[model samples]
Target: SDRVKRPMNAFMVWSRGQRRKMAQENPKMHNSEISKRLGAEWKLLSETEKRPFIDEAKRLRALHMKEHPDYKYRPRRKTKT
Candidate 1:
């Protein structure tokens, strides 16, 4: 798990400050919401366990787009210093 933690640490860089901007732009976006949307399985998962869920999130996202062809896509707001 040490090896997997290394990559996860790098990936978490994006999440650390994400809440700040997401809070402002998407008021409904909570940590739990993001994790659920990301299929991140908030159940004390290990890296190996989380990988499949992350991939599944991508698959579900595509499925959502196919189902809701008229839904608009919006990028999360970028923070400015």
Candidate 2:
């Protein structure tokens, strides 16, 4: 419940560019993989049971990242000389 509530809200507040940064180049992992590696219990879920977990994970991660901004990912290419 906590996971679902927080991350989704944060994602909504995240800039379009910030979200695009979250998207991977190759996307080698599934939701289950993402969940498992993040210490979430996503694999124990039934097909119907996993959506909330995944959704929450996304939300919390957004919040977490928002609290700890990474300037390395900034849009340097857009900077004019």
Candidate 3:
């Protein structure tokens, strides 16, 4: 399997942008630090502020579904029961 991906939410859109801004400014920072930092920043935002990213994510999901009607997210592969 060539890494079929999972759907992203509004927080993800924010994280991607924020990560670029932060990561570019400082290359020494840990990826996980940038990650957890954004999680903190996302909750700091209000619903009104987050609405645009949410709508953008809505469009992304809509487009993905239209393109791949039968696609499914298989998050876990359980080989041992």
Candidate 4:
């Protein structure tokens, strides 16, 4: 089955692009280190500064729902053996 694309929140949107750029610029850096830097940067942002990413995410969510009218999102349940 094809997986449904989940809507991204502001941090996710920011992190995706930022992480890509960081990876390209610092070829030797580990992803975990880059992620740590991203978290620090995101934490420092003011709500006003973060608005653009949040707005874009809202727009994407609306578009996703429209495109997948018949799709119902059922989150996975973990099974313990």
Candidate 5:
């Protein structure tokens, strides 16, 4: 059976929520602008604040590996012709 990869880390998950909130609050901002704001906000967060999400991400990764013991991630790359 094929499984969808869990690609997002703790920071990314948090960033996504922040992006959604920002988008809702200010309907004029583009995704690029929202992402830029998210990056700045994430940089200011204390490790203590970020810890829970990191822990959850680690737990999710462990579960993913347990369920897919043989799975290996091979990212795609471009090659010049």
Candidate 6:
């Protein structure tokens, strides 16, 4: 058995790059603010603008599913709902 990293969804894929951009553009900003801006900016993006991230996410997911068939997701919400 091998360890598998968690997968990023379409939004997460998009946010990854945007976070880098945010960090460089405003180096002094708080991490929380950057995350908030990224979240709000993501919500306003059009579907066409979202296509690349969606496609990339799908490709990673497809490959991951194929490569790690034995990998079962078992996230324990140890924090309690």
- The C-alpha lDDT values of all candidates are 0.47, 0.45, 0.65, 0.68, 0.65, 0.67
Q: In candidate 3, what residue range of length 10 has the lowest lDDT sum?
A: 1-10
Question: Which pairs clash (backbone N, Cα, C closer than 3 Å) in model 3?
Answer: none
What residue runs in model 2 are displaced by over 4 Å at the alpha carbon? Answer: 1-45, 72-81
What does candidate 4's lDDT look like per residue over 1-81, in tens digits? 554445787778767655655678878764888888878877888878677677666665775686646635546752431
Q: Assess every candidate by TM-score.
A: 0.30, 0.29, 0.43, 0.47, 0.43, 0.46
Q: Model 5: runs farther than 4 Å from truth?
A: 1-8, 47-81
RMSD of 5: 10.5
Off by over 4 Å in 6: 1-7, 54-81
User: In terms of TM-score, which candidate is stronger, 2 or 3?
Assistant: 3
Model 6 RMSD to the real structure? 10.5
Poorest 10 consecutive residues of model 1 by lDDT? 1-10
- The candidate that wins on lDDT is 4
lDDT of 2 by residue, 1-81 (tens): 333323444224333223333446436654454444434433343567445445556755766776634456546673532
In angstroms, how far off is 65's CA in candidate 2?
3.1
Of the pair 1 and 4, which is ahead by lDDT? Answer: 4
Cα RMSD (angstroms) for every candidate in the order listed: 15.5, 13.4, 9.4, 9.5, 10.5, 10.5
Candidate 3 residues lying further than 4 Å off, grouped into runs, are: 1-9, 47-81
Q: For candidate 3, what is the total of clashing residue pairs?
A: 0
Collision count for each candidate, in order: 0, 4, 0, 0, 0, 0
Q: What order do you get sorting by TM-score, best first?
A: 4, 6, 5, 3, 1, 2
* lDDT digits (tens) for residues 23-75 of candidate 3: 88888664998887777877788778777676666665665565645636556
